[PDB]
């Protein structure tokens, strides 16, 4: 299984609503490879400043997006997001 390079689980960001877990951006790391989320995958589009504010509690208003060719394209919805624990 070499083609299973990008088939490993990745950590997602949490939210306060009951909505789907979303990836930070549209790329993730697997088995020594930089991977790209599939088109349509739920994501957050944060600025570098916002990423620096990410804590384990809702202290960030995060722009919800949809992955398109490796880019998290915003849909206009905001969500309080944060890292687990």
């Amino acid at each position: 299984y070499e083609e299973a390079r990008c088939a490993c689980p990745a950590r997602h960001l949490n939210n306060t609503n009951g909505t789907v877990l979303k990836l930070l951006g549209c790329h993730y790391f697997c088995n020594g490879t930089l991977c790209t989320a599939p088109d349509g995958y739920p994501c957050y589009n944060l600025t570098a400043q916002q990423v620096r504010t990410l804590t384990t509690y809702p202290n960030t208003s995060c722009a919800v997006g949809v992955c398109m060719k490796g880019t998290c394209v915003k849909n206009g919805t905001m969500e309080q997001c944060f890292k687990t624990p």
Partner: protein
């Protein structure tokens, strides 16, 4: 943390290479069984696939 699978591995994993398994969060966009090999790789798998359910039964039957 909150681990979710973005891609399934559609091939077959030799059972002799499997160490354990777990299921990702119910809040993940895609439901997945994650298999952990002896080498330490985590491989995302489709829970609807019959081979996946049979692999879990095998790992459970080792108890």
């Amino acid at each position: 943390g909150r681990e979710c699978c973005l891609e399934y591995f559609k091939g077959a994993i030799p059972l002799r290479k499997l160490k354990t398994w777990y299921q990702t969060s119910e809040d993940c966009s895609r439901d997945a069984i994650v298999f952990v090999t002896v080498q330490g790789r985590a491989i995302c798998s489709d829970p609807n696939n019959k081979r996946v359910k049979n692999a879990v039964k095998y790992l459970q039957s080792l108890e």
